[PDB]
């Protein structure tokens, strides 16, 4: 049984590993390969701020709430292990800041120690009048990618750096199942006009004194179009733009300014932070994650495609529940093929 996962971003590798760990022991042969035209550090996952937190508003599909939860508990269960940091994983506490009262988020009980900020805490943030405190996890994408590829490699999964032109060519090259984990570029293999790039720019900074995440919201502005500060493993991420529809891969001057001034005002000590790097990523924005299976027909073998894309600005946050779901759909595929 030959499985090609297309994509080496967080979604690809997580899904690839989950499939292998679930079925290596029961299927023989099972051959899993990863194709992609960029690997770390060249994916959007690499640019990700690296924090577990869903959108403040609930999701359309309630399965996603669950996929987030599964992802959190998965990640939390690693805290305590010697290799947590090598995976890019470590606990962080921080603040969500609003200019007025808002409902509690659907994920309040999933995180650790959710509570509302007290009048004292707020004086720390002059420009805001309401907010939350909680404890969550950093998942640094660059590092987690390095961990997964190593974990994949150790188990004999093989990587191929290449550009897939169609699902057809890959099936024709001998894939029985295709897991489509192509992020914002899924539309090149099958038009999907619900999928748009969520263009976010970030500034990477050396400011090791900052131990807490700080995320502001501007309800009249759209999610992550207000300043945010997220301590990483060895640097800090500064953001404040997330504009959907823009396909520009290059850094922009106006965005640099919006992020720097917004964050400098939020966290004035930034005046002495050294700028280390500036990047631009595309979140695969979609009303809903596409995680379903599809039957494609070329030549003689019917080939099965399982999509797993459109995780917007929360791919790190939801990834494991999504992989888990794909490996189950895959199980069904094995079934119908009397393969167990």
Residues forming contacts to ligand FAD in the complex (CB under 6 A) are: 6-12, 35-38, 43-45, 47-51, 162-164, 181-183, 185, 188-189, 200, 202, 239, 281-284, 309, 311-317
**Member of 12, 59, 131, 200 binding ligand 96B (CB under 6 A):** 200
* Residue 140 near residue 236, CB atoms below 8 Å: no
Sign of the torsion angle spanned by Cα atoms 30, 88, 266, 99: positive
| Closest CA relative to residue 56, chosen from 258, 313, 241 | 313
* Residue 286 near residue 21, CB atoms below 8 Å: no
86 binds, among its own copies, ligand FAD, ligand 96B, none (CB under 5 to 8 A by kind): its own copies
315 binds, among ligand FAD, its own copies, ligand 96B, none (CB under 5 to 8 A by kind): ligand FAD
228 binds, among ligand FAD, ligand 96B, its own copies, none (CB under 5 to 8 A by kind): ligand 96B
Binding to its own copies (CB under 8 A): which residues in 125-144? 125-126, 133, 135, 138
**Member of 9, 239, 262, 310 binding ligand 96B (CB under 6 A):** 239
The stretches of 114-183 forming alpha helices (DSSP H) are: 119-122, 141-154, 167-172
By beta-carbon proximity to ligand 96B, the closer residue of 7 and 232 is 232
Is the peptide bond preceding residue 41 cis, with omega within 30 degrees of 0? Answer: yes
| Contact status: 224 vs ligand 96B (CB under 6 A) | yes
Element spanning 274, H or E: strand 274-285
By beta-carbon proximity to ligand FAD, the closer residue of 41 and 331 is 41
| Contact status: 269 vs its own copies (CB under 8 A) | yes
By beta-carbon proximity to ligand 96B, the closer residue of 30 and 138 is 138
- Give the pair of three-digit tokens for residue 59: 């999701």
Q: What is the DSSP string of 180-209?
A: E--GGGGGGTS--TT-EEEEEEEEEEE-TT
The span of 46-54, 119-127, 163-171, 260-268 binding ligand 96B (CB under 6 A) equals 46-54
The span of 49-57, 60-68, 84-92, 151-159 binding ligand 96B (CB under 6 A) equals 49-57
Length of the chain in terms of residues written? 340
Is the peptide bond preceding residue 120 cis, with omega within 30 degrees of 0? Answer: no
Please report, as ranges, the residues that interact with ligand 96B according to CB under 6 A: 49, 51, 53, 200, 224, 228, 239, 242, 283, 313
């Amino acid at each position: 049984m030959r499985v090609v996962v297309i994509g080496a971003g967080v979604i690809g590798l997580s899904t690839a590993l989950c499939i292998h760990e679930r079925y290596h022991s029961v299927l023989q042969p099972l051959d899993v390969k990863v194709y992609a035209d960029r690997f770390t550090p060249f994916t959007t996952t690499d640019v990700a701020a690296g924090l577990w937190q869903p959108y403040t508003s609930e999701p359309s599909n309630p399965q996603e709430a669950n996929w987030n939860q599964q992802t959190f508990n998965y990640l939390l269960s690693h805290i305590g292990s010697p290799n947590a940091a090598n995976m890019g994983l470590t606990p962080v506490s921080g603040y969500n800041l609003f200019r007025e009262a808002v409902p509690d988020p659907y994920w309040k009980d999933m995180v650790l120690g959710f509570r509302k900020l007290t009048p004292r805490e707020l004086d720390m943030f002059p420009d805001y009048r309401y907010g939350w405190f909680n404890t969550s996890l950093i998942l640094e994408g660059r590092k987690y990618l390095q961990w997964l590829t190593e974990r994949l490699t150790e188990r004999g999964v093989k990587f191929f750096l290449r550009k897939v032109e169609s699902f057809e060519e890959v099936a024709r090259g001998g894939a029985d199942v295709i897991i489509n984990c192509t992020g914002v570029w899924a539309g090149v293999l099958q038009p999907d006009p619900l999928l748009q790039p969520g263009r976010g720019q970030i500034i990477k900074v050396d400011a090791p004194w900052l131990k807490n995440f700080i995320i502001t919201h501007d309800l009249e502005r759209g999610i992550y179009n207000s300043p945010l500060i997220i301590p990483g493993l060895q640097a800090v991420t500064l953001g404040g733009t997330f504009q959907v529809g823009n396909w520009n891969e290059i850094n922009n001057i106006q965005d640099h300014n919006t992020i720097w001034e917004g964050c400098c005002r939020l966290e004035p000590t930034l005046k002495d932070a050294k700028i280390v790097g500036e990047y631009t990523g595309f979140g695969p924005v979609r009303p809903q994650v596409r995680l379903e299976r599809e039957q494609l027909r070329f030549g003689s073998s019917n080939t099965e495609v399982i999509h797993n894309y459109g995780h917007g600005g929360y791919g790190l946050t939801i990834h494991w529940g999504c992989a888990l779901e794909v490996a189950k759909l895959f199980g069904k595929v094995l079934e119908e093929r009397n393969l167990l």
